């Protein structure tokens, strides 16, 4: 019931919005998980690990370069924009909106959202494997050796770029190999980020879960905590629920969300 949701929305002083891959799939952005989610022979699972990076860093960089380069043509969608403009409008009234996103595509930033927690990192940040420094990077191509590489067709030959020529740390005395500042499979989420997220969730009085589910991860971490404070949680996602089923708006969030958040 949209009207009942909007009654809560009108009153809410602190809204937490959690976003998953559905909001990024609708911008034309491949996940690489599941059906057709291949890049050359591999799926995300096979590449987004420290073992892949240790054993074939050129291959893993080709994959991330491809993804960075594809983002240039993908644009934020009406769901991302509604979220950003909602934050702006409510912020002017002293009402707080924060976005907690699983997505690494930075589309929320491009849409205009300011208060964003990227819990899985970003395609457009690097971390130095030597000195640990994190730096924003939108350079196209990230380094000359990667220029025009990363083709996704399975019979593409590997670039086999020497490690010295992959993206390097620019504080010249270090010069360490850079990696994407993304959380990989088998790695822990940042504790500092999680403590900030816990504080926001504990203060919020309405929570939305967009393009994922309350019951899958990462949403399953957060949303119980908010529900147990008695706070309404509203899902916007394409997934069905039974009819023998706190709010669920079924469909593409780029349709549902601008209406719900207007």
């Amino acid at each position: 019931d949209l009207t009942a949701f909007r009654e809560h929305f009108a009153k809410a002083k602190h809204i937490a919005i959690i976003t998953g891959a559905g909001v990024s799939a609708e911008s034309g952005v491949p996940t690489f998980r599941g059906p057709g989610g291949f890049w050359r022979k591999w799926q995300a699972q096979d590449l987004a690990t420290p073992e892949a990076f240790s054993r074939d860093p050129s291959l893993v960089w080709e994959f991330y370069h491809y993804r960075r380069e594809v983002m240039r043509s993908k644009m934020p969608n009406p769901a991302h924009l509604a979220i950003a403009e909602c934050e702006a409008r409510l912020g002017q009234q002293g009402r707080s909106v924060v976005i907690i996103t699983q997505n690494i595509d930075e589309l929320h930033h491009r849409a205009g959202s300011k208060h964003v927690y990227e819990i899985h990192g970003s395609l457009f940040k690097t971390r130095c494997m030597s000195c640990g420094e994190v730096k924003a990077n939108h350079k196209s191509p990230i380094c000359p050796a990667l220029d025009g590489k990363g083709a996704p067709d399975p019979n593409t030959k590997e670039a086999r770029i020497p490690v010295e020529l992959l993206p390097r740390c620019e504080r010249k005395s270090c010069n360490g190999l850079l990696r994407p500042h993304v959380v990989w499979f088998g790695e822990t989420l940042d504790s500092d980020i999680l403590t900030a997220v816990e504080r926001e969730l504990e203060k919020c009085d309405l929570c939305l879960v967009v393009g994922t589910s309350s019951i899958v991860y990462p949403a399953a971490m957060f949303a119980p905590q908010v529900a147990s404070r008695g706070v309404p949680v509203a899902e916007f996602n394409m997934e069905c629920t039974p009819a023998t089923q706190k709010y669920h708006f079924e469909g593409p969030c780029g349709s549902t969300l601008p209406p719900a958040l207007e």
Binding site: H120, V183, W184, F185, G186, E187, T188, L189, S191, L194, Y217, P218, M221
Partner: peptide, 8 residues
Amino acid sequence: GVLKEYGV
């Protein structure tokens, strides 16, 4: 620290 997916 929390494994992503829970390491699933």
